[PDB]
Amino acid sequence: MSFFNLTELGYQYPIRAQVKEPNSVYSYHLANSLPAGSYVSHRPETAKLPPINMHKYNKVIEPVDNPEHHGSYVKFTERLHKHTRCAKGPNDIYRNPVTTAQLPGSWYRKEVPLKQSEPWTYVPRHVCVSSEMTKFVKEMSVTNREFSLF
């Protein structure tokens, strides 16, 4: 469907394809055409054997009201201006990422640390501890400007 009914060339819903919880779907039943009483002739195109139980095909996507933004670009804009980042991350609201700019930071799992999840990424850090006078100069030079000890 969609693009010229070429079908087997990708996803018809490229964003909805990789979503952890997609929107609920409505299996509608169309009001056909003719009223409740009329004879129907079997046209010589179908078969006397029954039609498909067309349940997974009559579909339509209804919106959902997530508490992030109520499907409204204007509220999205004052959230962006207020700099309130969304709660669930791209590793949570999606599957493996859609855009390629989400690849930096795709290994981050919030529930488990990286060292526990895979132990082969452990690098022992070699850092020199800051001494007492270096800590003193560092904490003082932030607060004051006209003071210097050798």
Partner: peptide
């Protein structure tokens, strides 16, 4: 494919 197999077994 379930429904057509019913008439397949029928005849």
């Amino acid at each position: 494919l379930e429904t057509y197999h019913q008439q397949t077994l029928y005849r």
